[PDB]
Write an enzyme that holds these catalytic residues in place. Structure first.
Site, PDB file in Angstrom:
ATOM      1  N   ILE A  32       0.796  -1.234   0.000  1.00  0.00           N
ATOM      2  CA  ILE A  32       0.000   0.000   0.000  1.00  0.00           C
ATOM      3  C   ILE A  32       0.830   1.286   0.000  1.00  0.00           C
ATOM      4  O   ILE A  32       0.276   2.377   0.145  1.00  0.00           O
ATOM      5  CB  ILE A  32      -0.998   0.034   1.187  1.00  0.00           C
ATOM      6  CG1 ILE A  32      -0.258   0.022   2.532  1.00  0.00           C
ATOM      7  CG2 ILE A  32      -1.962  -1.139   1.090  1.00  0.00           C
ATOM      8  CD1 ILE A  32      -1.137   0.337   3.727  1.00  0.00           C
ATOM      9  N   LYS A  34       5.181   2.959  -1.041  1.00  0.00           N
ATOM     10  CA  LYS A  34       6.566   2.770  -1.449  1.00  0.00           C
ATOM     11  C   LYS A  34       7.281   4.110  -1.448  1.00  0.00           C
ATOM     12  O   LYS A  34       6.689   5.138  -1.771  1.00  0.00           O
ATOM     13  CB  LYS A  34       6.626   2.125  -2.837  1.00  0.00           C
ATOM     14  CG  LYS A  34       8.024   2.032  -3.435  1.00  0.00           C
ATOM     15  CD  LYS A  34       8.152   0.864  -4.406  1.00  0.00           C
ATOM     16  CE  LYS A  34       8.418  -0.436  -3.663  1.00  0.00           C
ATOM     17  NZ  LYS A  34       8.205  -1.658  -4.488  1.00  0.00           N
ATOM     18  N   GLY A  35       8.553   4.092  -1.067  1.00  0.00           N
ATOM     19  CA  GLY A  35       9.363   5.305  -1.022  1.00  0.00           C
ATOM     20  C   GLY A  35      10.828   4.945  -0.982  1.00  0.00           C
ATOM     21  O   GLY A  35      11.195   3.804  -1.253  1.00  0.00           O
ATOM     22  N   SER A  36      11.668   5.917  -0.652  1.00  0.00           N
ATOM     23  CA  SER A  36      13.105   5.668  -0.480  1.00  0.00           C
ATOM     24  C   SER A  36      13.346   4.720   0.684  1.00  0.00           C
ATOM     25  O   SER A  36      14.102   3.753   0.563  1.00  0.00           O
ATOM     26  CB  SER A  36      13.832   6.977  -0.208  1.00  0.00           C
ATOM     27  OG  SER A  36      13.089   7.752   0.724  1.00  0.00           O
ATOM     28  N   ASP A 154       7.978  18.229   6.152  1.00  0.00           N
ATOM     29  CA  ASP A 154       7.475  17.848   4.832  1.00  0.00           C
ATOM     30  C   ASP A 154       5.955  17.821   4.809  1.00  0.00           C
ATOM     31  O   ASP A 154       5.347  16.866   4.354  1.00  0.00           O
ATOM     32  CB  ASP A 154       8.064  16.494   4.414  1.00  0.00           C
ATOM     33  CG  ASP A 154       7.918  16.223   2.927  1.00  0.00           C
ATOM     34  OD1 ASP A 154       7.775  17.196   2.144  1.00  0.00           O
ATOM     35  OD2 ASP A 154       7.940  15.035   2.547  1.00  0.00           O
TER      36      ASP A 154
HETATM   37  C1  LIG Z   1      -2.667   3.669   1.930  1.00  0.00           C
HETATM   38  C2  LIG Z   1      -3.853   3.498   2.881  1.00  0.00           C
HETATM   39  O1  LIG Z   1      -4.946   3.204   2.397  1.00  0.00           O
HETATM   40  N1  LIG Z   1      -3.703   3.688   4.220  1.00  0.00           N
HETATM   41  C3  LIG Z   1      -2.547   3.984   4.835  1.00  0.00           C
HETATM   42  N2  LIG Z   1      -2.469   4.171   6.158  1.00  0.00           N
HETATM   43  C4  LIG Z   1      -1.219   4.448   6.597  1.00  0.00           C
HETATM   44  C5  LIG Z   1      -0.830   4.685   7.854  1.00  0.00           C
HETATM   45  C6  LIG Z   1       0.502   4.957   8.151  1.00  0.00           C
HETATM   46  C7  LIG Z   1       1.432   4.978   7.115  1.00  0.00           C
HETATM   47  C8  LIG Z   1       2.797   5.235   7.346  1.00  0.00           C
HETATM   48  N3  LIG Z   1       3.929   5.448   7.529  1.00  0.00           N
HETATM   49  C9  LIG Z   1       0.994   4.722   5.824  1.00  0.00           C
HETATM   50  C10 LIG Z   1      -0.291   4.476   5.597  1.00  0.00           C
HETATM   51  S1  LIG Z   1      -1.021   4.153   4.238  1.00  0.00           S
END
Ligand SMILES: CC(=O)/N=c1/[nH]c2ccc(C#N)cc2s1
EC number: 2.7.11.23
Length: 342
Positions: A32, A34-36, A154
């Site tokens: 769900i 993706k990053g560095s 950021d």
């Molecule tokens: C992508 C989605 O539907 N829900 C999300 N929920 C979250 C909660 C925390 C983080 C971090 N770091 C990333 C996500 S992505």
């Protein structure tokens, strides 16, 4: 040929797989994010009986050391009792798994960028924008707690997520680029669209840079398009000047990077360098918001809570969030005291 016994790839990421069971607890669903730093997976916690968001850091010292700073910031926030901390995303727990540092977070919903996208970049109401505004101002009051003094660094629409699809509750994510207040180490910070003038100019900076970014974000949520969409820093600064005019002379007299955007004339005054743009301070926020003209693109005419007075309260707040002087810029406490939130 192989990395981490076939568990990692080229970029040191963990190869995620549907339905994989970690430590007889977490049941992995799907990728769900993706990053560095690495990846973010959706997983069902079978102990707590709840969905969680697991941030899997790359198996690399550089990223690991950064994740350890983030853990330390999140844990430090969880130490405080105040109810303002629930506008920050919640680190449940962390653990090592197959040489990766995994941070477990509560499962949040859509980010505000996808919300703009869902409107086809036409924006959301002043009513919803008030609700996001008020929550964000509280989150920043929280980070400004003396013992924290955390600069998120950021702030942008995609780093703000809804807790629930069906509610206007929001939380701030991604504290990877964050640090606590201190002597200046970093100068290339913030996403350009939301980058403050002190950073652009390369002057000393504090928690006030997050408020500048907040003001840019609140105008974007309502109009639907970024307020300052510079392709580069020269373009970014010119686009700021369009709305707010030339930065005061005493500011530019201090700035290391003044001459990257401006030139000091023989009379002492500062003017733009040529590269296009409207003259300084003629793209008025008054008109970008559509104060007296039914909102942005006239699409809010006749909608409750979108009167001329309401727009003038929204406008006034934003101008105090986009003050050029970070000393004079509006602080989160006085912002929550503003007529717009009555
Ligand atoms: C992508 C989605 O539907 N829900 C999300 N929920 C979250 C909660 C925390 C983080 C971090 N770091 C990333 C996500 S992505």
């Amino acid at each position: 040929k192989v990395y981490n016994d076939g568990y990692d790839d080229d970029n040191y990421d963990y190869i995620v797989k549907n339905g994989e069971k970690w430590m007889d607890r977490y049941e992995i669903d799907s990728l769900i994010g993706k990053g560095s730093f690495g990846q973010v997976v959706k997983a069902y916690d079978r102990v707590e009986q709840e969905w969680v968001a697991i941030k899997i850091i790359k198996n690399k010292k550089a990223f690991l050391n950064q994740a350890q700073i983030e853990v330390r910031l999140l844990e430090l926030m969880n130490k405080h009792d105040t109810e303002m901390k629930y506008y920050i995303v919640h680190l449940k727990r962390h653990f090592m798994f197959r040489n990766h540092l995994c941070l477990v977070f509560e499962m949040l919903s859509y980010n505000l960028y996808d919300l703009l996208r869902n409107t086809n970049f036409r924006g959301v109401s002043l009513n919803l924008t008030r609700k996001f505004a008020q929550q964000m101002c509280t989150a920043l009051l929280f980070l400004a707690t003396p013992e924290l003094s955390i600069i998120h660094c950021d702030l942008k629409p995609e780093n703000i997520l809804l807790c629930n699809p069906k509610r206007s509750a929001i939380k701030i994510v991604d504290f990877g680029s964050s640090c606590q207040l201190g002597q200046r180490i970093y100068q290339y910070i913030q996403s350009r669209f939301y980058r403050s003038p002190e950073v652009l100019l390369g002057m000393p900076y504090d928690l006030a840079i997050d408020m500048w970014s907040l003001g840019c974000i609140l105008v974007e949520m309502h109009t639907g398009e970024p307020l300052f969409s510079g392709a580069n820093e020269v373009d970014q600064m010119n686009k700021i000047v369009e709305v707010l005019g030339i930065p005061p002379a005493h500011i530019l007299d201090q700035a290391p990077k003044a001459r990257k955007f401006f030139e000091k004339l023989p009379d002492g005054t500062w003017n733009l360098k040529k590269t296009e743009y409207k003259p300084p301070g003629t793209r008025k926020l008054h008109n970008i918001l559509g104060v007296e003209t039914g909102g942005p693109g006239g699409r809010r005419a006749g909608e409750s809570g979108h009167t001329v007075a309401d727009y003038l309260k929204f406008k006034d707040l934003i101008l105090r969030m986009l003050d050029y002087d970070p000393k004079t810029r509006i602080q989160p406490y006085y912002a929550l005291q503003h007529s717009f939130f009555k």
